[PDB]
């Protein structure tokens, strides 16, 4: 049911959609 | 955590709802 590990970038695409124009901490590079 | 719940397993969205500053 739409359940898969979001690693690489898909996560950031879903991380900036739940926060908004504020920004989130997620750039382990 | 984000890579321990999204990369180690599946992440829905409520998990990333706490990482929003």
From Swiss-Prot, chain A:
It comes from Homo sapiens (Human). The chain holds residues 25 to 53 of 110 of the full protein. This is Insulin B chain. The lineage of its organism: Eukaryota, Metazoa, Chordata, Craniata, Vertebrata. Changing residue 22 to Q: In MODY10; reduces binding affinity to INSR; reduces biological activity; reduces folding properties.
């Amino acid at each position: 049911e739409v359940n898969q590990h979001l690693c690489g970038s898909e996560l950031v695409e879903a991380l900036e959609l739940v926060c908004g124009e504020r920004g989130f901490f997620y750039e382990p590079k | 955590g984000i890579v321990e719940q999204c990369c180690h397993s599946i992440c829905s969205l409520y998990q990333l709802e706490n990482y929003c500053n």
